[PDB]
Design a protein around this ligand. Structure first.
Ligand SMILES: O=c1ccn([C@H]2C[C@H](O)[C@@H](COP(=O)(O)NP(=O)(O)OP(=O)(O)O)O2)c(=O)[nH]1
Ligand SMILES: O=c1ccn([C@H]2C[C@H](O)[C@@H](COP(=O)(O)NP(=O)(O)OP(=O)(O)O)O2)c(=O)[nH]1
Ligand SMILES: [Mg+2]
Ligand SMILES: [Mg+2]
Ligand SMILES: [Mg+2]
Ligand SMILES: [Mg+2]
Lengths: 223, 223
């Protein structure tokens, strides 16, 4: 697949997931159940979650090494919400072509970097830039995307890694919606392992959408 | 006590807590253990925590009522970090006098409001304003304070409530620092109750700093 085709495929999957999660015409701002949708909030909130993967707190557990696998899933979570924002702002090929034209995107398709603990305050500054942009109004989507890819590169992702991990988390997101996430009946911890970690384990063995879903269903039945 | 004396007292307590947590001259940007201090980050991160007290997620547990007691402690957490920022920006009476002169502060000293579920998206917008301001650079402290008091009023606090709850959480913060919070040895959940909830229970019975600390020490020994 070309890079544009990868992007198109992600947009298609995001569209489908958002239709299932929110009902059709979620682009107009409300779920079927009448919850207000703010992709700006989803983004800055997920950024805060990403910040918590690092030892940013000067007063608490001040020596802990980063779990970069956790960081990778967070970067993927943010990407789900950025895709959603693009879709809302509103022809997947057209949007993919625009994303592909962001200058840093070419750098993002290269071989990945291996970050270390030395890189955390730089990473944190980049996340803070995104939180600032998305918590304000009238920002430029292209600038958002640039900053995001710069961050993703710092965190050791490239397009290949993003796509693989995105496909997996997209499955888990669909799974949750089919299993009571909205009504609060879903159980997130399965015999002591968080669903995201069951997923991370599954993503060690090169599977398609439907097979990932089956493996999740099988682990969940044991909860 | 006058309102300025209350403010002065909060600044004094924050100073003492920050000296104990961070060592002297934390105002210069680093703890004794060499962790970088960013009060801007402490503020926007605590704002994100406050947002999580509400049913903001359109896709998860979409019917849950707000626990306003939890909201009150979060507003108090934010206040610890705003006090810290003021101290760093840098004579407690002088700073208290400046805070007292913020126009909305007079409104904050009046009888409190009883918020309901109708008030959440307005509250969320105000928190978002604070996240935006503090995640950027060169903002005005007075404008921060105004926005904060407006939020606090929306969330059902006034100066009396803020002060009482602040004193209590300040004790718990000192307690954590004396009991391994930095080195990660501290245990946050005590026979199934989070330390913040043990505190909230203690704050039902009108106690001074030292007596609160003793009650915490007694519950913690059972963990
Ligand atoms: O309309 C939506 C809503 C959510 N999402 C997905 C994107 C993201 O991957 C995911 C985040 O879900 P949560 O915030 O509910 N939980 P997370 O997986 O972040 O875990 P945790 O409970 O560990 O914080 O929700 C969508 O894609 N579209
Ligand atoms: O230098 C500091 C560092 C922290 N603090 C306090 C302010 C705030 O009340 C408190 C927040 O502590 P945490 O973020 O560690 N935990 P919280 O109490 O917010 O609970 P939880 O674990 O429920 O998220 O730390 C200071 O006052 N000065
Ligand atoms: Mg999340
Ligand atoms: Mg997440
Ligand atoms: Mg906190
Ligand atoms: Mg808190």
């Amino acid at each position: 697949m070309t890079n544009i085709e990868i992007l198109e495929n992600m947009l298609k999957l995001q569209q489908k997931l958002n239709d299932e999660t929110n009902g059709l015409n979620w682009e107009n701002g409300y779920t079927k159940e009448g919850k207000l949708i703010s992709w700006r909030r989803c983004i800055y909130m997920e950024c805060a979650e990403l910040i918590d993967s690092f030892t940013w707190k000067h007063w608490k557990n001040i020596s802990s090494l980063t779990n970069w696998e956790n960081v990778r899933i967070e970067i993927v979570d943010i990407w789900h919400f950025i895709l959603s924002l693009l879709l809302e702002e509103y022809d997947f090929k057209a949007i993919a072509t625009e994303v592909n034209a962001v200058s840093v995107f070419q750098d993002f398709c290269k071989e990945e970097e291996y970050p270390n603990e030395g890189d955390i305050y730089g990473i944190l500054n980049d996340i803070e830039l995104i939180i600032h942009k998305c918590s304000g109004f009238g920002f430029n989507l292209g600038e958002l995307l640039s900053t995001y890819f710069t961050l993703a590169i710092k965190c050791g992702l490239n397009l290949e890694i993003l796509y693989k991990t995105y496909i997996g988390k997209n499955v888990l997101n669909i799974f949750r919606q089919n299993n009571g996430y909205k009504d609060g009946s879903y159980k997130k911890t399965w015999n002591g392992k968080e669903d995201n970690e069951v997923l991370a384990q599954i993503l060690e063995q090169e599977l398609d959408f439907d097979t990932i879903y089956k493996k999740l269903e099988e682990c969940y039945k044991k909860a």
